Design a protein around this ligand. Structure first.
Ligand SMILES: [Ca+2]
Length: 782
């Protein structure tokens, strides 16, 4: 019943890792390797469940992260034939809660994922063949269901034995209404040891006062709903409800609305483990001070020899408010298809029960071109889908529609350690999936950038690179200069979209890549959506002009080329560049080309000056940086290092149908050398491409950080570049190594920025790795 297991990530249920990757700095996040596929739409709030069956990831509070199991949130199975057996389908709690429950033995089945579908196939315990397919309706080109806070658990049971079986399927859940909010919002900003600003998150975990549960029973569906008394109007962050439903007509329904998840769970288990029933309870008493509450239902059915039954179970959660900074209130996009009152969980669940099979068909339909591609390896089909997981679990925001944002505004975090949105340098590579599958969301993000470019915040704030532990004497720079390009679209502790350039490790008002990134993204988004959206192009054009003028001020000598200087001033933000760099110089030339193309289409007056700049700048870049084998890092440092991502501009120019920014023979020779050195002489091509090595495969400096890291998303960009330049075998080999490192070593559903050669990672749950879609785009004909 797992469809195309070979294009799915699989692991035996509850099989762990001998030696997973671990975080390279102790102050940074490492929950360990037990992430499974997240459930829930983008910006819906999401929950994750591990390959052991534990619901351990709670992202119901928009942009916030909690990792921890609530053992009572779980499916349990009872079967009786020859023998009687009953198991909760998670791991045994370590702290002794639910001591009466028995837990499914590890290694007795397969967990499989191709996002947004996953499967538990249970085998070798029960006599029935039992599969649970878990999915949310994540649909490309669909700006409705993709936002929904629903998970479908589609169970298939079949009896392969000579004897009739009695089965019962239970879902219990703890009422967490009111838990998912910050009691310390707009808190003091601390500088962490890696230089990043951090805030304090103090959720109301375990605060259940007023929480109650009721059974739901109609002609069509039955289950439970988890609420809180009172429910204010309007709701505040944390206010809402859960529901879970099955259709009627499928067997005998046992409901128990109120049981104690902190106790031994015997009230439930003494019935369930014996005959698959529960004691009848419909008790909406609000929970007392100090008291936790949970609900459960079980469905009991018989399965005759050779019979197959399916049971759809749907969970829905209606938490409509995302509050960011204190008093900064947005509604979630799904509210446009119900309302903003936070009283809709049953109606959402009901819609799911009605539509789940349609949604399942639609998922098979959009994935079918990928799975049937004749020139894509199995691992790639798998990773292409699986890397979409971050669009759900990356602190994703998707707001309610407005006139100027007709499908809502959208944002994914750079990551959990680096808690701000849609970092521009990062999305250069990381935004290829969003462009291809949700181009209206892609456009809203770029429109948010466009609007922010002219704004300013003169307020002086600490720059982390320079911080020496005293706030008052610390070097500070203006939050944002008018017409500078912001690094990001703000943070979940402030105001996403509207308050930009939140990052403070460097002063991004000085960065030399961001302006080019902005232009290249605008043009790419216009071109790859048919070259017809003149509204998008006209809206972004003033910002294109402002961006390029901003970056042109950093051309000190007037040769046409902006020069790096000072603190690290581009995406490799622990790596100092001096003078014209290959990286930023390249992006600049590709940007100018892009602005010339778009500006000509739009008939704009700036086109003449961009052609003059490019006529000076383009020959000059080769003239300055060619060393005979590759492009020099920069003009000022005298470094002999090979930067793997030196010709990012040439990748982009060609991707965009624009003229080569360098001689294609030089491009090809540079790229061959990057591959032969940065990949093949970095521990023999075991990890992928290091960002910078000497021509002999040694580090320039054995202690440097960025040069000696493999950036997953940079590697995917490089693969795409290789493929576009005709080095096909090379692209597939490099991309394979990176996928294997992630999906074999405990990084699945938390893909990081960086791996080292020493079993360590940096910045789990990272935006860049969606760059695997750039390879799909260049190789995908069709
Ligand atoms: Ca919040």
């Amino acid at each position: 019943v797992i469809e195309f297991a070979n294009c799915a990530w699989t692991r035996a249920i509850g099989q762990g890792w001998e030696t997973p990757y671990r975080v390279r700095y102790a102050s940074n996040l490492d929950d360990g390797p037990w992430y499974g596929m997240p459930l829930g739409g983008f910006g819906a709030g999401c929950i994750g469940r591990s390959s052991a069956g534990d619901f351990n990831l709670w992202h119901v509070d928009g942009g916030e992260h909690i990792f921890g199991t609530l053992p009572a949130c779980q499916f349990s199975l009872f079967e009786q034939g020859e023998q009687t057996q009953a198991y909760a389908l998670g791991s045994a709690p370590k702290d002794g809660r639910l001591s009466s429950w028995q837990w499914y033995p590890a290694g007795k089945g397969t967990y499989a994922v191709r996002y947004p579908r996953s499967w538990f196939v249970y085998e070798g315990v029960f006599r029935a063949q039992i599969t649970c397919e878990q999915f949310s309706p994540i649909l490309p080109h669909n700006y409705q269901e993709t936002s929904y806070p629903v998970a479908v658990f589609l169970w298939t049971f079949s009896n392969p034995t000579d004897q009739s079986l009695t089965l019962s399927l239970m879902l219990s859940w703890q009422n967490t209404v009111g838990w998912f909010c910050n009691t310390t919002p707009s808190s003091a900003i601390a500088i962490r040891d890696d230089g990043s600003p951090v805030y304090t998150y103090t959720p109301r975990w375990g605060q259940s006062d007023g929480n109650f549960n009721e059974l739901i029973q109609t002609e069509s569906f039955q289950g439970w709903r988890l609420r809180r008394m009172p429910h204010p109007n309007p709701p505040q962050e944390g206010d809402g409800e859960w529901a879970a439903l099955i259709p009627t007509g499928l067997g005998e329904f046992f409901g128990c609305s109120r049981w104690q998840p902190e106790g031994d769970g015997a009230h439930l288990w003494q019935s369930f483990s014996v005959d698959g029933s529960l004691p009848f309870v419909n008790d909406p008493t609000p929970a007392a001070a100090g008291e936790q509450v949970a609900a459960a239902f079980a469905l009991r059915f018989s399965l005759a020899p050779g019979e197959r039954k399916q049971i759809p179970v749907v969970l829905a959660w209606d938490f409509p408010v995302t509050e960011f900074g204190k008093g900064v209130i947005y509604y979630r996009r799904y509210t446009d298809f119900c309302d903003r009152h936070g009283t809709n969980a049953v109606t959402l669940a009901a819609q799911a029960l009605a539509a789940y099979a349609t949604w399942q068909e639609q998922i098979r339909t959009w994935q079918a071109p990928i799975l049937s591609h004749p020139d894509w390896p199995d691992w790639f089909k798998m990773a292409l889908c699986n890397e979409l997981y971050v669009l759900s679990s990356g602190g994703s925001l998707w707001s309610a529609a407005s006139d100027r944002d007709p499908v809502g505004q959208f944002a994914v975090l750079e990551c959990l350690d680096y808690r701000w949105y849609e970092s521009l340098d990062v999305r250069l590579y990381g935004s290829f999936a969003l462009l291809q599958l949700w181009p209206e969301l892609e456009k809203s993000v770029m429109r948010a950038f466009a609007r922010a470019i002219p704004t300013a915040d003169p307020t002086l704030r600490i720059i982390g690179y320079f911080y020496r532990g005293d706030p008052e004497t610390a070097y500070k720079a203006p939050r944002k200069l008018a017409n500078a390009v912001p690094h990001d679209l703000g943070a979940p502790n402030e105001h996403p979209w509207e308050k930009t350039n939140y990052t403070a490790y460097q002063d991004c008002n000085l960065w030399k890549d961001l302006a080019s990134d902005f232009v290249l993204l605008v043009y790419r988004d216009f071109l790859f959506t048919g070259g017809t959206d003149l509204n998008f192009a006209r809206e972004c054009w003033p910002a294109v002009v402002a961006a390029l003028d901003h970056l042109k001020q950093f051309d000190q000598d007037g040769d046409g080329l902006p020069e790096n200087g000072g603190a690290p001033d581009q995406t490799y933000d622990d790596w100092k560049l001096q003078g014209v760099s290959a990286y930023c110089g390249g992006l600049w030339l590709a940007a100018l080309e892009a602005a010339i193309a778009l500006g000509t289409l739009l008939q704009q007056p700036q086109v003449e000056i961009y052609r003059q700049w490019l006529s000076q700048a383009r020959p000059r870049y080769h003239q300055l940086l060619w060393n005979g084998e590759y492009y020099r890092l920069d003009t000022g440092s005298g470094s002999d290092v090979i930067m793997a991502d030196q010709l990012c501009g040439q990748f982009y120019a060609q991707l965009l149908g624009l003229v080569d920014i360098v001689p294609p023979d030089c491009c090809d020779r540079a790229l061959r050398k990057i591959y032969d050195t940065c990949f093949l002489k970095f521990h023999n091509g075991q990890f992928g491409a290091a960002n910078g090595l000497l021509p002999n495969g040694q580090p320039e400096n054995p202690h440097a950080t960025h040069p000696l890291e493999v950036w997953t998303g940079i590697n995917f960009g490089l693969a795409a570049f290789l493929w576009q330049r005709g080095m096909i075998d090379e692209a597939w080999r490099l991309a394979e190594v990176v996928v294997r490192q992630i999906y074999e070593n405990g990084l699945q559903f938390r893909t990081p920025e960086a791996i080292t050669a020493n079993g360590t990672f940096r910045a789990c749950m990272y935006l860049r790795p969606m760059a695997i879609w750039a390879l799909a785009l260049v190789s995908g004909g069709s």
